[PDB]
Design a protein around this ligand. Sequence first.
Ligand code: MG
Ligand code: MG
Ligand code: MG
Ligand code: MG
Ligand code: MG
Ligand code: MG
Ligand code: MG
Ligand code: MG
Ligand code: MG
Lengths: 55, 142, 211
Amino acid sequence: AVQQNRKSRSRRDMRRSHDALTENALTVDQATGETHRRHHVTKDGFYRGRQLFAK
Amino acid sequence: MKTLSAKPAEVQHDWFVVDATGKTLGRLATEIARRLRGKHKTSYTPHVDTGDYIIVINAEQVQVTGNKALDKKYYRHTEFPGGLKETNFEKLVAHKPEEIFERAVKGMLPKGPLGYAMIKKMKVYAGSEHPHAAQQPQVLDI
Amino acid sequence: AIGLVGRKCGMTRIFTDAGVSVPVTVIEVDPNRITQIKTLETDGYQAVQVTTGERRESRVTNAQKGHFAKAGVAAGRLVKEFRVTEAELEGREVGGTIGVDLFTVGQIVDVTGQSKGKGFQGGVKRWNFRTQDATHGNSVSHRVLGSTGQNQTPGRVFKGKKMAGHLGDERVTVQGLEIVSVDTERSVLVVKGAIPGATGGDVIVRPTIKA
RNA sequence: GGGAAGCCUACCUCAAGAUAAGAUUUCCCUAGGACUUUAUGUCCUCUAAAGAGCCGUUCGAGACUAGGACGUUGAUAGGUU
RNA sequence: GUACUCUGGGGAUAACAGGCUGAUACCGCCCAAGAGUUCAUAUCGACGGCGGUGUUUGGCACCUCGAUGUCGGCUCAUCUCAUCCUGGGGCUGAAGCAGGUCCCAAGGGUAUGGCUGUUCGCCAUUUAAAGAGGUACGCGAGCUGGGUUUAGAACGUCGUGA
RNA sequence: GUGAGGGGAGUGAAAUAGAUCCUGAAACCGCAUGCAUACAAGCAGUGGGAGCACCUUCGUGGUGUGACUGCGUACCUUUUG
Ligand SMILES: [Mg+2]
Ligand SMILES: [Mg+2]
Ligand SMILES: [Mg+2]
Ligand SMILES: [Mg+2]
Ligand SMILES: [Mg+2]
Ligand SMILES: [Mg+2]
Ligand SMILES: [Mg+2]
Ligand SMILES: [Mg+2]
Ligand SMILES: [Mg+2]
């Protein structure tokens, strides 16, 4: 099956009106003072007062 | 250019009360629709609503002539395959006179947004008393 | 009709003196606490609103806290109403308790609950359709719906056509169940038959309406 | 007046987007300026209430959604007994 | 001669379906000799006449040949009453149990197999019953391809031959 | 990223003449401003028409949008149509 007429740009945009993105949950860490994803380990290896990959 | 139209902001609507006991449905409905659309005012315009508010009292006391008390049938249809409901005038005016008057007046009014706005200016009550006492309505003959 | 709000605990059997095994269902009932009484002059109808369960203070909002404090009862896990008459309203004041002693052994009742959800289901399981042949050159169409209607008259699909969709998870009332017995020290009602819902769901038991 | 598996109620479910948008109980928000076009007027300063959402552990809920319970004042999930 | 076929064109012109018409078919009504029996307009009813719907066979060529692509079977349904059962009545050669005719009533229900591609029809055994029809003679961008109507081969008939 | 690409400086009469290099249109695709739009049915226009927003040779004026309303079933071929 295929369309019988063109779809105007208005209907196309009305259909695309549900394609908006959303932001993530970012919080400031209490220990390192850096922005990080909530409930996630910081990129340096720190999470909840603990430090992985001791250097 | 000299022919002017009514400004919708400058139109004023006044309240009236009509008693519907022992009156024929058709003539009363025509008069109500005429006074509701605004044909009685000299500033009448077809695209502006200049009517008045009409309150009907004693809605169940309306009467019809001949044998239309049992032969007048009202039909409605739900788009289901077998949903054709049919009712009589007697039972309908017994338990819902407002539907009777609303049908009678909507049948004689234009079909569109202006008609939908005009039909809201009519109030129908079965009892002999109406809550719109603050607007100070004036009694109308018929 | 004054009823009770209980929780389904599971199914069991009970052997009589003659040896007949009766399949029963257990409903545990915490003593309901009357929260509000609705009369005709203020609301237009007469009813009794009760609550049951237990909820922590962190999950109860300020509005519900004020409502329960006005009622003078502890906060429950749910609240339900019962449409009653003035004859059944004798000795029913706010803050009271509707115990399990409302029913008697041998009474016919109705049980209302929430059925289990099966998810998006097809026609065969939902409307008891018939499956086509699996052999004799049959194509990919095995459990399909089949035809839908006529071609040009009316030329559309009628409203109410049976098709695939969500199944279950809906309010269901089963009438005609006999309370096989009631135990007040454990506050339970064992009733003959099966009731809708899974274990741990809320059910409503009311007196029968057909008698 | 009597009068049928016929109609309206009666039984079960849905239902106020019924734009005619209904009702009940409870809860929350009571500061200091400037200017103009003196108006539920526009810019500043000071607080963000009751609640909802984001996130996480999850389900007898579930295509994605939505819905139910819980988040150290904890038995929501895993482990152990 | 082409069923091995091909090109340019047509609904100007056929086969299927729709439309107009209702000769034909179905149903109803009027008069009525006669008949079962010696009589009951209880029940049929000759010779004649008047209408209704559009379910059969037909007539006409208005749409479609720069395509409306199907005989039957399967799954899935919806509507009409000219009612098969269940429901309510009048009359009767209605003693009762039963039967026959007519009126009202569409809520629900309204078989399995053998033989054939079968629709249909015949047969065996059940049920309260196994109703008549419309919907592109419902439904093939939902399934099947057994029949018809491509290309191979043979028999019977016709042709000197294709 | 010792990449592509871009912003400065500089050359040039001219750099939206920068090597995808004279001028550089339409279909098509973004951003900003102004008005309208989430209870009302169809060739999307036309004749009226209130309001709103910027202009002023401050008007029985201009530029945009335009709720509400009467009427209104595209173009070409071939045909009795
Ligand atoms: Mg089968
Ligand atoms: Mg149509
Ligand atoms: Mg001709
Ligand atoms: Mg009949
Ligand atoms: Mg019968
Ligand atoms: Mg098709
Ligand atoms: Mg409306
Ligand atoms: Mg609006
Ligand atoms: Mg115009």
